[PDB]
A paper describes a structure:
A potential target for antibiotic drug discovery is β-ketoacyl-(acyl-carrier-protein) synthase II (FabF), which is one of the essential elongation condensing enzymes of fatty-acid biosynthesis, a highly conserved metabolic pathway among key microbial pathogens. During fatty-acid elongation the acyl-carrier protein (ACP) substrate transfers a fatty acid to the S atom of the catalytic cysteine of FabF. FabF requires a catalytic triad, which in the P. aeruginosa enzyme (PaFabF) comprises Cys164, His304 and His341. An unusual feature is a completely buried potassium-binding site that was identified in all three structures.
Numbering used by the authors:
A (entry chain A): 2 to 413
B (entry chain B): 4 to 413
Write the structure that this text describes.
């Protein structure tokens, strides 16, 4: 029946760094990765900043010939994946390649490539669309290209669930392993939606912070002066592995993935209900899946995107699920520093949750200068808090009311 | 926990619902024609499978519909159809146990085109406020859950040609695991626009048989020259067996197996031996606890491509051995074209209906079977025959493979 799933490898590109340790160093130091966007002219836009990946060198991962065929979200996804596989120490062979799969997702995918090709179509005609437009832009090609590069022949797929993509990708990949469909999965997500369509689109929806004068203070979850999310880019990948498989090869085990929960709000296209009813049902599903007492939860890495309705819904949901224990645990939003990585958010935040377990420290919610009415939990304001963490949750409560919760536990 | 199919819904190039589409399938009718909605003079391919006469206001108000990309409208239509067909009554007692997994290969290309037009010509402040929510792939699942009040697992797959097949398979897993009693699963696509036809055209992936569009899709025929791009949607209501029995549901068939693999070979062209497709079919059969000899009908991937079609023949021969000549295999894409994200969903429906009616759909246009294509490919005309177990295959871009196994329920 249901086999146990552990984390043996991790990889990442974020607004804070070009790998896991550098990103984590920034997280624990309370550093913002948010800055005015330099790669395009945003003078005509209401938001002119975000979390860019800085100094990415694709030549550390892929030949120039292969890299030019790929949208940045694919480059980022492959980078995080290559890091995670290397980190795991796993040797891929004919004996195991059929048992190793991939589930790397994205919220929007190759929007830069789509936009660029639409410009070519409109101004020059259809014969100027790139032959690599489809294979270089569709969301499943992170899973596609990774499997080809490394010879991974197990289950191969891709989620697209907006803010929840990375969380679903990791959860369902653990389900594959638990079910016996695979012994190893590379899972997570990637995003690069910082183009005219992305910044303009979220801008037209009035979804983004417009705090152009102080970009590092823009992302401020649970603060009374929050005004929308900050768009960020990057990727996270984890190597998930069946427990006995990991033990048999003497793998280093970071943590155990013990629970995964899902729900739908069935409420609104963009905003959650203020009581966070769906989020609460999601966390409850996750806790039951993990066979845990709620009081066992020590740290919650929040969705916390710095939106009026979104942030307050999470407080309400945490209070409903945990009761008086809501005041004993610590919850923080690392999006205060990284901004919102959309399809990659759940992946980088799973990594942060695993590292919170490794290092026994809760990452801060920076910018929490004045908590809003009712936001009176331990939200780890301003600075990292060393504390006991035996169980960590990571929440993603995304566009369309799609909810996912992952439950991680210390392994010994 | 066993999983059964209690409702189905569809938009295809052959009809605006399941029965109309199925009638076309059994008649050998083509849904492919020159594309009318845009000027394709400068394009190498000027035809495909369009949904004709779709009326969204049978499902949604004009205001609701306006914001949503066509792929979402199509996905909602199939989903609404399937839920209605199932007879399920949604209540407070069960709403947290009913979820949605509707996917798409490429999603809102038409809305992206339109908002690009506005961005380039007049700037970012002229992008639609509803662009993002009305264009992102998970919004079929999102909108459906909101409209019907469904609070169970809510997600979306995007695995090109295999989307619909993965969506149905993984929704069945949700039910089997106990995280849901009912799932609405499938896919939708509306990519037969400028970016889609131009994009696949640039990749030289499409048939260019502009002079005879109905003859263009010709799986395993020696003169095939690429796939035909088509629009539409399919949706299935998957239900736990006891749940279905307790409410007296009509059960079309049972979903008994789901298999996956990766080729880890090429972007678009599978290995000639179909090794990945073979592993996938074997995985599906193992999941179902069935021997290859129990399979009666296979609804192929069969997109009408040189490498793709022949890999499937090789895969079927390796998996089924001598029994490969006893079963029937056909590609309904010969009539429907390739619905991309919706292909696996509409083809799961065709497989279920093959079981209901005991008839194998034809592979039309199979005038001259290519070298080695000597199986029973149901050439030209529908074939009544015994069908106890049916497979549906999807072997998609990226080498991503999925196989569903359906069985008669008595
Ligand atoms: K989180
Ligand atoms: K099929």
């Amino acid at each position: 029946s249901r086999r146990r799933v552990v984390i043996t490898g991790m990889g990442m590109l974020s607004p804070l760094g070009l790998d896991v340790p550098s990103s984590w160093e920034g997280i624990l130091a309370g550093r913002s990765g948010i800055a005015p966007i330099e790669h395009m002219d945003l003078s005509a836009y209401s938001t002119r900043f975000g979390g860019s990946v800085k100094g990415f060198n694709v030549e550390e991962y892929l030949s120039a010939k292969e890299a030019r065929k790929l949208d940045l979200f694919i480059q980022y996804g492959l980078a995080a994946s290559f890091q995670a596989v290397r980190d795991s120490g796993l040797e891929v062979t004919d004996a195991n390649r059929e048992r190793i799969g991939v589930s790397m997702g994205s919220g929007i995918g190759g929007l830069t490539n789509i936009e660029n090709n639409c410009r070519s179509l409109f101004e020059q005609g259809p014969r100027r669309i790139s032959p690599f437009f489809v294979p270089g832009s569709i969301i499943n090609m992170v899973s596609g290209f990774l499997s080809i590069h490394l010879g991974l022949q197990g289950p191969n797929y891709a989620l697209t669930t907006a803010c929840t993509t990375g969380t679903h990708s990791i959860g369902m990949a653990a389900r594959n392993i638990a079910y016996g469909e695979a012994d190893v999965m590379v899972a997570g997500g990637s995003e690069m939606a910082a183009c005219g369509l992305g910044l303009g689109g979220f801008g037209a929806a009035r979804a983004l912070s417009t705090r152009n004068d102080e970009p590092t203070r823009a992302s401020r979850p649970w603060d009374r002066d929050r005004d929308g999310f900050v768009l960020s880019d990057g990727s996270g990948a984890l190597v998930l592995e069946e427990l006995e498989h990991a033990r048999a090869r003497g793998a280093r085990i970071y943590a155990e993935l013990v629970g995964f929960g899902m729900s739908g709000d069935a409420f609104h296209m963009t905003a959650p209900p203020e009581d966070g009813a769906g989020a609460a049902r999601c966390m409850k599903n996750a806790l039951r899946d993990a066979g845990l007492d709620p009081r066992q939860v020590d740290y919650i890495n929040a969705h916390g995107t710095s939106t009026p309705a979104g942030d307050i819904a999470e407080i309400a949901a945490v209070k409903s699920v945990f009761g008086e224990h809501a005041h004993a645990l610590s919850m923080s939003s690392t999006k205060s520093m990284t901004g919102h990585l959309l399809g990659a958010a759940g992946a980088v935040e799973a990594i942060f949750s695993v590292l919170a377990l490794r290092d026994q420290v809760a990452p801060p919610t920076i910018n929490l200068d004045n908590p809003d009415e009712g936001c009176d939990l331990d939200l780890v304001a301003h600075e990292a808090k060393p504390r006991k963490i035996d169980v960590a949750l990571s929440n993603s409560f995304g566009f369309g009311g799609t909810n996912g919760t992952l439950v991680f536990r210390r392994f010994a």
